Swiss-Prot record, chain A:
Domain v-SNARE coiled-coil homology: residue ranges: 3-61
The protein's name: Vesicle-associated membrane protein 2
Shown chain mapped onto the complete sequence: 29 to 89 of 116
PTM info: Phosphorylated by PRKCZ in vitro and this phosphorylation is increased in the presence of WDFY2. (Microbial infection) Targeted and hydrolyzed by C.botulinum neurotoxin type B (BoNT/B, botB) which hydrolyzes the 76-Gln-|-Phe-77 bond and inhibits neurotransmitter release.
Tissue distribution of the protein: Nervous system specific. A higher level expression is seen in the brain as compared to the spinal cord. Expressed in hippocampal neurons.
Chain's role: Involved in the targeting and/or fusion of transport vesicles to their target membrane. Major SNARE protein of synaptic vesicles which mediates fusion of synaptic vesicles to release neurotransmitters. Essential for fast vesicular exocytosis and activity-dependent neurotransmitter release as well as fast endocytosis that mediates rapid reuse of synaptic vesicles. Modulates the gating characteristics of the delayed rectifier voltage-dependent potassium channel KCNB1.
Residues of the signal peptide: none
Cytoplasmic-facing ranges: 1-61
A biological process term (GO) from this entry: positive regulation of intracellular protein transport
Keyword Coiled coil part of the UniProt annotation: yes
Molecular function terms, GO-annotated: calcium-dependent protein binding; calmodulin binding; identical protein binding; lipid binding; molecular adaptor activity; myosin binding; phospholipid binding; protein-containing complex binding
UniProt membrane topology term: Single-pass type IV membrane protein
Keyword DNA-binding belongs to the record: no
Curated annotation (Swiss-Prot), chains B, C:
Annotated signal sequence range: none
Protein name stated in the entry: Vesicle-fusing ATPase
GO biological process: Golgi to plasma membrane protein transport; intra-Golgi vesicle-mediated transport; intracellular protein transport; positive regulation of protein catabolic process; positive regulation of receptor recycling; potassium ion transport; SNARE complex disassembly
GO function terms (MF aspect): ATP binding; ATP hydrolysis activity; ATP-dependent protein disaggregase activity; identical protein binding; ionotropic glutamate receptor binding; metal ion binding; PDZ domain binding; protein kinase binding
Included stretch of the parent chain: 1 to 184 of 744
Keyword hit for Disulfide bond: no
Record's subunit section: Homohexamer. Interacts with GABARAP and GABARAPL2. Interacts with GRIA2. Interacts with PLK2, leading to disrupt the interaction with GRIA2. Interacts with MUSK; may regulate MUSK endocytosis and activity. Interacts with CDK16.
UniProt entry tagged with the keyword RNA-binding: no
Swiss-Prot record, chains D, E:
Role summary: Required for vesicular transport between the endoplasmic reticulum and the Golgi apparatus. Together with GNA12 promotes CDH5 localization to plasma membrane.
GO CC annotations, alphabetized: glutamatergic synapse; neuromuscular junction; postsynapse; presynapse; presynaptic active zone membrane; synaptobrevin 2-SNAP-25-syntaxin-1a complex; terminal bouton
CDD domains: SNAP
Biological processes annotated in GO: apical protein localization; brain development; intracellular protein transport; membrane fusion; neuron differentiation; positive regulation of ATP-dependent activity; protein-containing complex disassembly; regulation of synaptic vesicle priming
Subcellular location as annotated: Cell membrane
Protein name as annotated: Alpha-soluble NSF attachment protein
UniProt keyword Cell wall biogenesis/degradation present: no
Keyword match Manganese: no
Family to which this protein belongs: Belongs to the SNAP family.
Organism per entry: Rattus norvegicus (Rat)
Record-listed Phosphoserine modification sites: 19, 22, 188
Swiss-Prot record, chain F:
Tissue: Expressed predominantly in cerebral cortex, hippocampus, cerebellum, adrenal medulla and retina with weak expression detected in non-neuronal tissues.
Family stated for the protein in its record: Belongs to the syntaxin family.
Functional note: Plays an essential role in hormone and neurotransmitter calcium-dependent exocytosis and endocytosis. Part of the SNARE (Soluble NSF Attachment Receptor) complex composed of SNAP25, STX1A and VAMP2 which mediates the fusion of synaptic vesicles with the presynaptic plasma membrane. STX1A and SNAP25 are localized on the plasma membrane while VAMP2 resides in synaptic vesicles. The pairing of the three SNAREs from the N-terminal SNARE motifs to the C-terminal anchors leads to the formation of the SNARE complex, which brings membranes into close proximity and results in final fusion.
Species whose genome carries this gene: Rattus norvegicus (Rat)
Full protein name: Syntaxin-1A
SS bonds (residue pairs): none
Swiss-Prot/TrEMBL site ((Microbial infection) Cleavage) positions: 63-64
Residue intervals of the t-SNARE coiled-coil homology domain: 2-64
Cross-link Glycyl lysine isopeptide (Lys-Gly) (interchain with G-Cter in SUMO): where in chain: 62-63, 66
Localization in the cell: Cytoplasmic vesicle, Secretory vesicle, Synaptic vesicle membrane; Cell membrane; Synapse, Synaptosome
Residues of the full protein shown: 191 to 256 of 288
Post-translational modification: Phosphorylated by CK2.
Amino acid sequence: NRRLQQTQAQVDEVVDIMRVNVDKVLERDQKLSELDDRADALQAGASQFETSAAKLKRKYW
Amino acid sequence: MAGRSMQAARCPTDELSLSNCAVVSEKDYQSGQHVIVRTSPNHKYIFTLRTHPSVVPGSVAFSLPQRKWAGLSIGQEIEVALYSFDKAKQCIGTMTIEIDFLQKKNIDSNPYDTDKMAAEFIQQFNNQAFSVGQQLVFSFNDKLFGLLVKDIEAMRQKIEVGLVVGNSQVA
Amino acid sequence: MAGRSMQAARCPTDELSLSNCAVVSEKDYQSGQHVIVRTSPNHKYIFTLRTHPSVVPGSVAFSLPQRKWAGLSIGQEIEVALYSFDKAKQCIGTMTIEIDFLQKKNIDSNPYDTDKMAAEFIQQFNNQAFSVGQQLVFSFNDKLFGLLVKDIEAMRQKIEVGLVVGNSQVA
Amino acid sequence: AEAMALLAEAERKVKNSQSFFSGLFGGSSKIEEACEIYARAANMFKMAKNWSAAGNAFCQAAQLHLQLQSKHDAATCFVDAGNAFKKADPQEAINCLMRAIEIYTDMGRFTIAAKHHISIAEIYETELVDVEKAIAHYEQSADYYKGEESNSSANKCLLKVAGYAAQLEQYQKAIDIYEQVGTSAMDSPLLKYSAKDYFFKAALCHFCIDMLNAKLAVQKYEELFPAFSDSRECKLMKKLLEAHEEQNVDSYTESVKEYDSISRLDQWLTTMLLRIKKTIQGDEED
Amino acid sequence: AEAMALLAEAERKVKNSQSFFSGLFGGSSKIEEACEIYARAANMFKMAKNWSAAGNAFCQAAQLHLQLQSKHDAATCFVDAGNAFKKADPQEAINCLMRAIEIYTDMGRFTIAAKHHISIAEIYETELVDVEKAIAHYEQSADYYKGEESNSSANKCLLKVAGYAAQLEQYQKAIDIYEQVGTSAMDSPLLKYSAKDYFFKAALCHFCIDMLNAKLAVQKYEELFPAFSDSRECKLMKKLLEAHEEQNVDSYTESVKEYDSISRLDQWLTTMLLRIKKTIQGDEED
Amino acid sequence: ALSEIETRHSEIIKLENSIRELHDMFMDMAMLVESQGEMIDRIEYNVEHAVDYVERAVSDTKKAVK
Amino acid sequence: RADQLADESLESTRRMLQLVEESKDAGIRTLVMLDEQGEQLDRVEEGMNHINQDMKEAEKNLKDLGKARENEMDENLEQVSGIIGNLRHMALDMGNEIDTQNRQIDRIMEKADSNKTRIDEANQRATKMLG
C-alpha cells in the first residue's frame, strides 16, 4: 500500500493540468478562427484600397 | 377467398414468434382467420393469422421455425387463400408431440411437470392450426423447446391438419 | 471464358456451405464447371460451381470457410474465368486431409468410422477441385469438421490443385 | 439613439433617387448611409437582448450593403445576422448563413465559406434536426478544406460525416470515410496516435456484412504487442469478431464489459456495440 | 459567368497595346484585367470540380501577372495553381511550386520560401519518388530556416534529410547530419529528451565501418543510470555493439526482439537493423 | 493474508483507472494543437501578404501627394 | 488471484510507462509547434503595426489631397512520475505563451477591422473626387 497510494494520486494531480491544457488550447482555436475571418476580410478591402489609391493617383499626380 | 399474391417477411416482435402464427396486416386479414400458403402444386401449409400495426399491406411475415418448415424465404412470392376449418373432423383431441430442447447451450432438466406444460400449451396455442411434422418453439418457464407434431387425432381418425381447442389434450 | 467481373456474396443455404462449392446462378454457369477467382496479381484460387435458384446473376456466393481461405469480400470486385483441368496429370488419386472438429465446443470422444467418411466425401465432393492448404468444412452426420488438405497426388507427381474423381482414394 | 427612429431614417434614405432629389448623380453614399443606420439599430437591439429585432435589422443593413457594391463587409454582416438569429429565439440563422456562403463562395473565398459551412451543418443538426442535409454540408465543406491542403479541418469534417453516418444506418459509407481519413492520416506521424480509433470504428461499423469485413480490416491494421496504445483498438475487435462468428451474445457482451475497465466506452461505441449485440441475438432467435 | 468565355476575353486583352488601343498610356492596367479574368475562371473551374482547368487557368493568370511586374500576387497564385494540380488529376503540381519559390526566394521572402520548399521536397518524395532532389530541397530549406533562427523547423528538415539519407546508403553523411542537429539541440532544454534518438540513429548508421565508430559515438553520449529517458537509446546500442564485435548474429537478433518491447521499432530502425543483421552473417560465412 | 493482498489490488486498478483517462487528454491535445497549427498557417499567410499588398498601396499614396 | 492482480495492474503500469512516454513525445511536438506558432505571430504583429502606420499616413495624405518486481515496478512508475517534470516544462511555458499571444491577437483583430473601416471611408471620399 506504500508505493501504491504514493503513485496513486501522483497522476491524479497530473490529470488536472491536462484539464487546463485541453481547455486553454481549445479557447485559442476559436479566437484564431475569429482573426481568420477579420484579417482576411481586411485585405479584402485592401484590394479596393489599392485600386482606390490608384484612382487618386491619376487625379492629383 | 380467390387467392392473392403476397410476399414473405420477417416476424415483427418476439411475442408473435412464440405464438407460431403468420403475422399480417389489419388492412388485409383479421386476427382469428386461417389461410393456406401455396408455394407449389404439391406443397400446401396452413397457418394462423395475427395482425400487427407493423406488417406492410400485401405481405405475410413468418418466424424462423416456420420458414425452416414451410421452406419459405425472405423475399419470395407466394399465394395465400382463406381457409375454414371443419369442427367436425379437424378438432384435435389427442396430439402427440416430440419435445426436445431447441438450444443445447442451457442444460437444466428439472422434473418438468407435463401436466403444467399441457396447461400452458393450450393457454397460448388455442384456436390455432397444427400440422403433422410441423416445427415450432415452446416457451415453458422462460425456456425454449423444439416441439415436433408426430400424430394428431380428432375427437379414432388420424388427420394431417387440425385445430387445437380448449378441451384439447396434449401428450 | 476470357474473364468477367462479378460480385462476391454469401452462401444461399447451409447445405451448400458444406459442399465447399462456389454457389452461382443458373443464368451464368452450371453445376460442374470450374473457375479461377482473381483478387490480386498474387492471389489466384480455384473453386467448383454449384447453381441454386437463390443466386443473382453477376455474382458468386462463397461460404464462411472459403472466405477464411481465399480472403474474399462480399461487395468487392472479383474476376472469374472458366478453368479446364488436364485430367491427364491433374486427377487426384491419393489426397491426404487433416480433419479436426471445426467447432472445439462440440468436441467428443466418440468413434468415427473413416470408411463411412471416405464414401460420403467422394459422394458429395466428386468431380470438384481441391488445393493444397485449402480450408473447408465436411458435413458428416450433421457434425461439422475442419478439413485441411495436406498433400495431393495424381494417378507419382505432386500438384497444388487437382480434380477429385470417382476412383479417388482419400485418407 | 432610438432604434425605431433609426430604422425609419434608414428606410427614408434607402431609395434610388431621381428627378429633383437626384440632380445629376445618384448616390451610393445614401444606400451605405442607411446601412450604417440599420447596423446602429441592430447593435442596440443586441444590447437590450431583443435578438429577434437585431437579426432582422442586420439583414436589412446587409441587403442594402449589396445594393451598394460591397459584397465583402456585407457577407460579414450576414454573419452577424446569423450569429444573432442563432443565439436568438427565431430561426432565419440558416438563411443568413446560406446568403453568406453564396457570397464568400462566389467571391473566391472558400476557406471562409467552409468555416461557416461547418457551422451550418452543425446547426441543421443540433437545432433543425436534419442530419440528411447536415452530412451533405459536412462533406462539401470537407472538400473545400481538402482543397486548401488543410488536412486537419478536412478530417474533422469527414469525422463528423462518418460519425453521424453510422448513426443513420450508413455503416458502409462510414467505414469508407474511415478508410480515407485513415489513409490520409498515416502519412503524417502526427496522427499515428489517434490512427487507432479510426480502425476500431471502421471495423465496428457493419453494413449488415455477413462476413469478416472487419476481420479483414483488423489484420490490415499494424498492431504491435509492445505498442500499448494499440491494446486500445484491435485487441478487443478480434475478440468481438469471434463472438459474432459464433452467435454468442455472451462472449461479446462480456468482452465489452471487460473492455469497459481498461478503456471507457463513449456514447458512440456503446450505441454501435448494442447494435451488433442485436445483430447477434437477432441471428439467434431469428 | 462562363469560364470558356472569360478565358477568351482575357486572351484578347493580354497583349502590349499600341496604335489607338494604347492611346497615350497603357500596359499594366490592361494585363491586370486578363489576370483577374483567368482567376475568375479558375475559380468556377475549381467549382465544377474541373481542377485541371482551374490549375492551368491560374497558371495563365500567374504568368500574365509576372508580365505586369508584381511577383508577389503572382507567386501566391502559382501556389493556388499548385493547390489545384495537387488535389487534381494532371501534373505540374511540382512546376507551380518551383515557379513559386523562384519568386519568394529572389524576392527575399525566404521564410515562406522554405515553407513551400518543404512541401515541395515532401511531394517530390511521396509522389514522384525522387529522393535525390527531395533531399536537396529538405536541406537547402533547413538552411533557410537556420537563417531565420527558426532552429525548430530547421531541425525538422535536417531530420528528414538524414532520415532519407540513411536509406540512400548515405550512412556516414547521415551520422554527420545527426551530429550537427545534435550539437544544435542541446542548447535548447526543450529538446534534450529527443536528443537521445539522434545518438541512437547516428550510432546505428554504419558506413561499412568495422571499427567502433559507434562504440565511440555511444561513449560520446552523456548518460548516467537512473534516466527514465536514456533507457531508450544507448543501453541497447552497447548490447548491439557487443553482438557485432563477436560475430554473434543471434544475440543481436534477440536483443532487437526484446528491445522491440520497451520501445517499438519504427520502419527506419527495422531497415537499418536488418542492414546490420546482414553484415554479421556475412562476416561469419566469409 | 488475502485481506492485505486484495487491498493492494483495488488500489492499483483504481490507479490504473485515473491513469488511462488522463493519458486520453494528452492524445486529444496533440490532435488539437495540430488542427490549430494548420489553421494558423493560413492566418499568418493571408496576413503576411495582406501587409505586402498594403505596403504597395501606401507607397503609392505617398508618391501621390508629392 | 493475488499474483493475477499484482501483475495485471502492473502489466498496465508498464503499458502506462510508455503511455506517458508516448504522450510526452506527443507533447514535445506541442512544445516545438507552440514555439513555432509564437514566432510566426511575432511577424504578424510586425505586419499589424506596419499597416497601422501606413494607414495613418495614407488617411492624412488623402486629406492633404482633398484640398525486484516492485523495485522495477517503481522504476517504471518513477519514470512516469519523473515525466511530470517534462509535463511541467510544457503546460507552463506554452500555457503562458497562450495569454501573451491571445491578448495580442485581440489587439490584432481590432486594428485589422479598424484599418478596414478607414479604407471604406477613404474610398468614399476619394470616389467623389476621382478622374
